[PDB]
Amino acid sequence: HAADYVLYKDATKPVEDRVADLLGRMTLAEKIGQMTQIERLVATPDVLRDNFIGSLLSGGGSVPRKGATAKEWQDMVDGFQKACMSTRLGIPMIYGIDAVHGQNNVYGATIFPHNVGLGATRDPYLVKRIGEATALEVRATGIQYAFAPCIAVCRDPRWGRCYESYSEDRRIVQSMTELIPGLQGDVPKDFTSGMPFVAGKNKVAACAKHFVGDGGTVDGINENNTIINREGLMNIHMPAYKNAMDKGVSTVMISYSSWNGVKMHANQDLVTGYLKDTLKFKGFVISDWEGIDRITTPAGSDYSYSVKASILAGLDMIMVPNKYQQFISILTGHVNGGVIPMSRIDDAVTRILRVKFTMGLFENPYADPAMAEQLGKQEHRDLAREAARKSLVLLKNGKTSTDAPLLPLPKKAPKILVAGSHADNLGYQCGGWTIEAQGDTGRTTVGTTILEAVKAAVDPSTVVVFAENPDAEFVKSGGFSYAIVAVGEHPYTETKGDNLNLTIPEPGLSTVQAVCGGVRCATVLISGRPVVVQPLLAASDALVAAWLPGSEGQGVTDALFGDFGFTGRLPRTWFKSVDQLPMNVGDAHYDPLFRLGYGLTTNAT
């Protein structure tokens, strides 16, 4: 009704009408800008305006500064948004980040257990509630888009991202797609499968990743080839993408991996033919980081081809993330030369705009300062603590069938020992994608280590001694009632985590042997995956697979001291040796140390 009315700016109008109205006004430069996502590290107000940039991200560890507050994050994001809103059309950018176990790049964010442990809970409603809390903590920092969930079905634990997979069993991964409506909100009653959805300003856009077969690569080699017939691809690796469509996942990220030698980032048949045309996905498809570069061998050796192949394959938004001028220049040339039709550009931009309008981003482009206090909120930590406890799998509770069960341990004892490299190391208990991509060691954020949790749990008369790596004599002479010893993997992600031997670093086993040799012991194993465990088992009275439980170490002691019983069950096969791999439930020659679904129980004290 005002004389300067512009339909796309009218919040009362249907999303599709707003999309069409804006699209019809855009120049080629404005269109290609929407398709471009850049790192905050290369962003400036002029770059964002002049190139009509559609999206920014923080990669792992890409932060305004170490220890930044929620408000500092909001101010940074809003500064970028102010630049984007100052363009001719005022299209807001969407800011993405890997919030994969909480808002994990941010100091003081609640850190939830990694996905493998969540699979052990068999509790999809718990995972939904984690999505809900994670959305609040992401919005606390002004960010609107999380690159989660990873719905890989990890079929070989030698993969460095196996901890990002809920299970080797697709049925468990499918169940855990409940993360999506946690992050985004529940879809309405009449909802069409494949449409994008986000409820509003207190929720975030989600991302089902990495499409498809990322968990199926040969020998678990990250980014490698997945060799499997269509029937197996569709039976193992694809199903959870359909659940994600049904729950309105807003975006899908493409895998670095290949399927039978075809790069996913160049696979028109799967990206356009299947995801878009068969599953009816109507959100946007985003590349992985320099994913189009890696289409070629060597990577980046023909970036012109990378742009052509990826955009023709059906990708909508490119996580460049640094060389935006080159990306934009090359894509512009391809359109100008008729190599890429305007129809393909218009489809990509239609999808990007659909997600942005749907989620309310044109109505609330800026951060809400009242949300900053959601970061690290005690209610969310209480949830993480529940999740950590439910994730724990009890593998042994007594050396013989006639021994007294060691767990639960008594809170009142004259003197107890807490030992091991992982007993008082917050970074190690969080693992990868915590503060940095690869994670880190020591007190990297706000949390409670296993040692701190023990001290918070025990009777006031119980003396707690910590020794990181005590010798056998120290233990034998110490007058201890029992010991809790924690060891395991160091933090990792992506290719750095690929590991053909799956043996934990020393000292780990040597400390368990020294401790358990002198006093009854409960071994807590911190890992992203099954690892060689027979020697640890042989030494230990009790052993718990605690995965990567996150910031809330009291989840571990909640079960050790019997406040709750152990309930977790293995979401993966535990192998006898790495020579067996790959080896999954349902295989012909299945000879596990512990089958998928195994877990001992205790009752609460």
Numbering used by the authors: -2 to 602
What do the study authors state?
In the barley β-d-glucan glucohydrolase, a glycoside hydrolase family 3 (GH3) enzyme, the Trp286/Trp434 clamp ensures β-d-glucosides binding, which is fundamental for substrate hydrolysis during plant growth and development. HvExoI folds into a two-domain structure consisting of an (α/β)8 barrel (domain 1) and an (α/β)6 sandwich (domain 2) with a 13 Å-deep active site pocket embracing the subsites −1 and +1, positioned at the interface between the two domains. HvExoI catalyses the hydrolytic removal of nonreducing glucose (Glc) moiety from a broad spectrum of poly- and oligomeric β-d-glucosides. The crucial role of substrate binding in HvExoI implies a pair of the aromatic Trp286 and Trp434 residues that form a clamp at the +1 subsite, which is positioned next to a pocket-shaped site at the −1 subsite, housing the Asp285 and Glu491 catalysts.
The well-defined electron density maps of the (1,3)-linked thio-ligands illustrated that the saccharide moieties were attached through the networks of H-bonds formed between nine to ten residues in each case. The W434A mutant was sensitive to 4NP-G3SG and G4SG-OMe, and the data with 4NP-G3SG correlated with substrate specificity and catalytic efficiency. Remarkably, W434A lost all hydrolytic activities with poly- and oligosaccharides, except (1,3)-β-d-linked β-d-glucosides, turning this mutant into a strict (1,3)-β-d-glucosidase, albeit with low specific activities.
